[PDB]
Design a protein around this ligand. Structure first.
Ligand SMILES: [Mg+2]
Ligand SMILES: [Mg+2]
Ligand SMILES: [Mg+2]
Ligand SMILES: [Mg+2]
Ligand SMILES: [Mg+2]
Ligand SMILES: [Mg+2]
Ligand SMILES: [Mg+2]
Ligand SMILES: [Mg+2]
Ligand SMILES: [Mg+2]
Ligand SMILES: [Mg+2]
Ligand SMILES: [Mg+2]
Ligand SMILES: [Mg+2]
Ligand SMILES: [Mg+2]
Ligand SMILES: [Mg+2]
Ligand SMILES: [Mg+2]
Ligand SMILES: [Mg+2]
Ligand SMILES: [Mg+2]
Ligand SMILES: [Mg+2]
Ligand SMILES: [Mg+2]
Ligand SMILES: [Mg+2]
Ligand SMILES: [Mg+2]
Ligand SMILES: [Mg+2]
Ligand SMILES: [Mg+2]
Ligand SMILES: [Mg+2]
Ligand SMILES: [Mg+2]
Ligand SMILES: [Mg+2]
Ligand SMILES: [Mg+2]
Ligand SMILES: [Mg+2]
Ligand SMILES: [Mg+2]
Ligand SMILES: [Mg+2]
Ligand SMILES: [Mg+2]
Ligand SMILES: [Mg+2]
Ligand SMILES: [Mg+2]
Ligand SMILES: [Mg+2]
Ligand SMILES: [Mg+2]
Ligand SMILES: [Mg+2]
Ligand SMILES: [Mg+2]
Ligand SMILES: [Mg+2]
Ligand SMILES: [Mg+2]
Ligand SMILES: [Mg+2]
Ligand SMILES: [Zn+2]
Ligand SMILES: [Zn+2]
Lengths: 25, 197, 97, 214, 91, 97, 127
RNA sequence: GGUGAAAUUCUUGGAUUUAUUGAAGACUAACUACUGCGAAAGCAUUUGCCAAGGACGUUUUCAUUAAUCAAGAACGAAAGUUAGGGGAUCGAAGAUGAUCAGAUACCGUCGUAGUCUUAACCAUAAACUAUGCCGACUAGGGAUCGGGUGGUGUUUUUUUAAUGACCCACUCGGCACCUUACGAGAAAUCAAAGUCUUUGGGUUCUGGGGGGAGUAUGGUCGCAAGGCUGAAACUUAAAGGAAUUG
């Protein structure tokens, strides 16, 4: 749970939420 | 017309008769109308000037340079291109030079070149944007445009022709020792696929 | 100083600028020293140089071009040549090399 | 498998007249066989020697000097000046901490047309009565100290021929003359012309060489 | 008013060819239509002819130069390198 | 808790210093933090000089020292003999030997 | 009355070099390196290997006529070590006690006014 | 060659090493420090031009013009983005030789982008003194950088001067340091982190248990990577700070 990487993951897996809410148009 | 670089019309008096012989050079970046140009072994080292290669120090940047002496210019004539001199061998005078393509090469130290860089550099940095822009490009060059892929023809017309899908079928890298009618594709290629260099 | 020996000249003295005024300044011998910009053509330069020998008027060549000399005399236009007529209370007439 | 040394021959080296001890040593070259001109394999070589050897005394035990082989008069190699440098120990021992280094260079051309770069070194020293431990210069003194040094270094070349420069270097004369110009600006201790490098040479003129043979 | 946010001169092209390509020629169309100062008469009156042909309005010197600007960075450097070399054969 | 008043090491009043490279490790380290030590030694170890004394021509020849300045990162410096962990109250001392 | 060559050792780690040449440097005479007197693949740097190297070196220096030698020891340098390998001392001593006349030694290891990046990454060679 | 030791690689077309040269691009060693400068980010080769700045000096000048600041602006390491140059070195990716139970890690050889640069973006770092700025006051001591003042003072010896260097003494201003607390603090420690329950000199920002979460949503900036602003359901009795003994 190194913050640097609990936070890389937090972004890796939040642009994914952004890029999948645009499929749903 | 049809040349990226511009040309310099340069006039000299005739040494052996009372007239003018005008010469048609390729313009090096920086020479201007009304400039004086100096041509020959003792001519000084400034852009515009033609000198034999053995008479220019190692590092000089030159264009329109001869392969054999007196051929009047073979290497490095297109816009923005030049050759660097890398060294000398005054025993049987030869001069090593690097060409635009990155090829090194040795040529007779009497081979003349013009100091500086061919004008018009950077031409190929602008997107053509439009078929027509390239229509008129080859309008003034030769009937080589446009190009239909062989894969879109019938097998009567091209090694790549035919088939119920558009596909090449055998490998597309062709032996160098192939024969006319068979050399379509990547002739004598030695690798292939996207580079790492 | 170096360059502002011209700031002296415009206040404490009289000057004229441009080519065909500094031949009228020179055929009449009443010009003590002229300054020539760097980019004024060579043919122009040797004409003002010949008027120098005939008027016993010595000459200075300038680091910048005609765009730079204009601002050097606080003018807002290009000036290829300038003629000094009186230093008056300046420092330039004597002190040069 | 052939012992390539038996095909090789010795040539003794004589230095310029400007040096006390002229005959130095010997070198080696393959013998002049068919189209092989060992003369050409000889000229162009260079060798560096401590000034202790050229002048016998050891107060120039630093200061190596290079020398290059020009025309050979048959089995003797007459050589000409090529360049001088401070051995790295002498150099690295002058750069003690807690004191300011000063350096300058200037590329000048000599009476005989020789263009060359010459390097000066100098370290500020403490004044005798000092109580603070460092004796640093002040960057305006350094600029001033730098300015005067380049003027004398330039004035001595072109106010001297190259051979004259050899004549005026072995005595370390210009160190004093630089010491006699910066005395009023800051103390300074290790004033030295640290290096001399030959950048270009004129047409041969073998006459100048044979002036250095006796 | 400000006529447009970013397209600038490439408004003529409208919506076609892709924005990045349009942005790529905007750069060079500004360069090539610019008025360059004259190295001879000091006037901002040099404008491109054909590619590589730069010529001043009044003083009418013509300079062979870049395809879209009057002096490519490469030729500026080359002028440096030759000077550095010339300044040495001069010594 | 803050272990040293020098924070890491000896930089007060600039903000950024510049990096050097450990001679053993190659690691980047700010110059003010590096552990510095001079290897001032002769080119001869214990003995081997009077085994070379009569081996030399040149009656009068001094002994040239071989100079080289060394920078250590913290980790290397600790792992060699260069510095050692010190007590709490012993860390405030700048006596070399 | 005595004659001269120049020594030129290279005290690297992983190896030490000993080869002498005309005071010119151009024409050289027998090179022998520390990895010719061992074949363990590792200890080519070792002092023992350097001794056997100088001893086999000086013998060839006698066979042609080198009375004496000036020496120029040299670490790797560049951006790499500046501190000379362990088989430098051993070769030099194994050269005096070998019977050549000497004097005028310099450390010629190359050092930059510095420049160009060092290998390792900024976290250093970590093991 | 490289390494703990190896191997990948190179080599009788002579490598490695030597000597003589040449090119290219980055860097600015040693000198380099409890030293300087800058609003901060940061700035170390020479010289030239260009504007700028603090401190000091001052029986010059205006006279309250000032402190701190929602809104709004400039600058902002490294990496990253777009285009041209440049591309020696190092080198995310990658490729490989090892090591390993595995080892697309550490170590070894390569190596793309990158590293430099111009023209545009980006706006963030343990961007740290983890200490807002202005003002006032309250201990002891020795150094140092700048500027000034003083002395039959040492050398400069140019004869003595006079400067520069130095010495001693003062002082204004700055980077810091030592001792100590009389005071502060949970303590580590602190000359401010003091002049506070004996609680008020002026002002700006931020925090209110731990998670969830800098997430969701709206807005906005960005080409993008992302930045700025920013919840709630829900869950939990501790997380946490400093020190003590083992
Ligand atoms: Mg097609
Ligand atoms: Mg069809
Ligand atoms: Mg067919
Ligand atoms: Mg086929
Ligand atoms: Mg087909
Ligand atoms: Mg298809
Ligand atoms: Mg297909
Ligand atoms: Mg008129
Ligand atoms: Mg801790
Ligand atoms: Mg400051
Ligand atoms: Mg910082
Ligand atoms: Mg050193
Ligand atoms: Mg090895
Ligand atoms: Mg470890
Ligand atoms: Mg070789
Ligand atoms: Mg460079
Ligand atoms: Mg300083
Ligand atoms: Mg430096
Ligand atoms: Mg705001
Ligand atoms: Mg940045
Ligand atoms: Mg950046
Ligand atoms: Mg690029
Ligand atoms: Mg690269
Ligand atoms: Mg590498
Ligand atoms: Mg990998
Ligand atoms: Mg690796
Ligand atoms: Mg980039
Ligand atoms: Mg912004
Ligand atoms: Mg922040
Ligand atoms: Mg903070
Ligand atoms: Mg506070
Ligand atoms: Mg205060
Ligand atoms: Mg106090
Ligand atoms: Mg003072
Ligand atoms: Mg005084
Ligand atoms: Mg006094
Ligand atoms: Mg909470
Ligand atoms: Mg949002
Ligand atoms: Mg519980
Ligand atoms: Mg704790
Ligand atoms: Zn014009
Ligand atoms: Zn380390």
């Amino acid at each position: 749970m190194r913050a640097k990487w609990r936070k890389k993951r937090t972004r890796r897996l939040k642009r994914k939420r952004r890029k999948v809410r645009a499929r749903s148009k | 017309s049809g040349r990226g670089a511009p040309l310099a019309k340069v006039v000299f008096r005739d040494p052996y008769k009372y007239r003018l012989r005008e010469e048609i050079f390729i313009a090096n970046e920086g020479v201007h109308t009304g400039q004086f140009i100096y041509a020959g072994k003792k001519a000084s080292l400034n852009v515009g000037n033609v000198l034999p290669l053995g008479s220019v120090p190692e590092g000089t940047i030159v264009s329109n340079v001869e392969e054999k002496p007196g051929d009047r210019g073979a290497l490095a004539r297109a816009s923005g291109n030049y050759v660097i001199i890398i060294g000398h061998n005054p025993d049987e005078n030869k001069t090593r030079v690097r060409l635009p393509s990155g090829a090194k090469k040795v040529i007779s130290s009497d081979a003349r070149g013009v100091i500086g860089v061919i004008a018009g550099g950077g031409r190929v940095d602008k997107p053509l944007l439009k078929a027509g822009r390239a229509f008129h490009k080859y309008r003034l060059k030769r009937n080589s445009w446009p190009k239909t892929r062989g894969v879109a023809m019938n097998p009567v017309d091209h090694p790549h022709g035919g088939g119920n899908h558009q596909h090449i079928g055998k490998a597309s890298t062709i032996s160098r020792g192939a024969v006319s009618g068979q050399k379509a594709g990547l002739i004598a290629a030695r690798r292939t696929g996207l580079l790492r260099g | 100083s170096i360059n502002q020996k011209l700031a002296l000249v415009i206040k404490s003295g009289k000057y004229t600028l441009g080519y065909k005024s500094t031949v009228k300044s020179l055929r009449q011998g009443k010009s003590k020293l002229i300054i020539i910009a760097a980019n004024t053509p060579v043919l122009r330069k040797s004409e003002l140089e010949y008027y120098a020998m005939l008027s016993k008027t010595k000459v200075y060549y300038f680091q910048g071009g005609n765009n730079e000399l204009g601002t050097a005399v606080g003018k807002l236009f290009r000036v290829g040549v300038v003629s000094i007529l009186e230093a008056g209370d300046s420092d330039i007439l004597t002190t040069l090399a | 498998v052939v012992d390539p040394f038996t095909r090789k021959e010795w040539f003794d080296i004589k230095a310029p007249s400007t040096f006390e001890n002229r005959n130095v040593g010997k070198t080696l070259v393959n013998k002049s066989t068919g189209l092989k001109s060992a003369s050409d394999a000889l000229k162009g070589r260079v060798v560096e020697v401590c000034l202790a050897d050229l002048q016998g005394s050891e107060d120039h035990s630093f200061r190596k000097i290079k020398l290059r082989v020009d025309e050979v008069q048959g089995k003797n190699l007459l050589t000409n000046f090529h360049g001088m440098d401070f051995t790295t120990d002498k150099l690295r021992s002058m750069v003690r901490k807690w004191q300011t280094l000063i350096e300058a260079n200037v590329t000048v051309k000599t009476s005989d047309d020789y263009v060359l770069r010459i390097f000066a070194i100098a370290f500020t020293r403490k004044q005798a009565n000092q109580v603070k431990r460092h004796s640093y210069a002040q960057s305006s003194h350094i600029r001033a100290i730098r300015k005067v040094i380049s003027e004398i270094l330039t004035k001595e070349v072109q106010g001297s021929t190259l051979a004259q420069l050899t004549s005026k270097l072995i005595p370390e004369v210009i160190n004093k003359e630089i010491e006699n110009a910066t005395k009023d600006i800051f103390p300074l201790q290790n004033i030295h012309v640290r290096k001399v490098k030959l950048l270009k040479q004129p047409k041969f003129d073998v006459g100048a060489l044979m002036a250095l043979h006796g | 008013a400000k006529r447009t946010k970013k397209v600038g001169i490439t408004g003529k092209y409208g919506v076609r060819y892709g924005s990045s390509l349009r942005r790529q020629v905007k750069k060079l169309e500004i360069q090539q239509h610019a008025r360059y100062d004259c190295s001879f008469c000091g006037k901002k009156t040099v404008k491109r002819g054909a590619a590589g042909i730069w010529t001043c309005s009044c003083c009418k010197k013509t300079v062979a130069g870049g395809a879209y600007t009057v002096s490519t960075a490469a030729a500026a450097t080359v002028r440096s390198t030759i000077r550095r070399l010339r300044e040495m054969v001069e010594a | 808790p803050k272990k040293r008043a020098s924070n890491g090491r000896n930089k007060k009043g600039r903000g950024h210093v510049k990096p050097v490279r450990c001679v053993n490790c190659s690691k980047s380290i700010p110059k003010d933090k590096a552990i510095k030590r001079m290897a001032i030694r002769n080119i001869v170890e214990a003995a081997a000089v009077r085994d070379l004394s009569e081996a030399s021509v040149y009656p009068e020849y001094a002994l040239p020292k071989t100079y080289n300045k060394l920078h250590y990162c913290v980790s290397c410096a600790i792992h060699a003999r260069i510095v050692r962990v010190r007590s709490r109250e012993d860390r405030k001392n700048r006596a070399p030997p | 009355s005595q004659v001269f060559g120049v020594a030129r050792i290279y005290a690297s780690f992983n190896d030490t070099f000993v080869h002498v040449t005309d005071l010119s440097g151009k024409e050289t005479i027998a090179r022998v390196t520390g990895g010719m007197k061992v074949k363990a693949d590792r200890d080519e740097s070792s002092p023992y290997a350097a001794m056997l190297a100088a001893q086999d070196v000086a013998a060839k220096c006698k066979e042609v006529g080198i009375t004496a030698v000036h020496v120029k020891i040299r670490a790797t340098g560049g951006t790499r070590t500046k501190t000379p390998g362990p088989g430098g001392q051993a070769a030099l001593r194994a050269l005096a006690r070998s019977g050549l006349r000497i004097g005028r030694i310099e450390d010629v290891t190359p050092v930059p006014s510095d420049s160009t990046r060092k290998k390792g990454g900024r976290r250093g060679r970590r093991l």
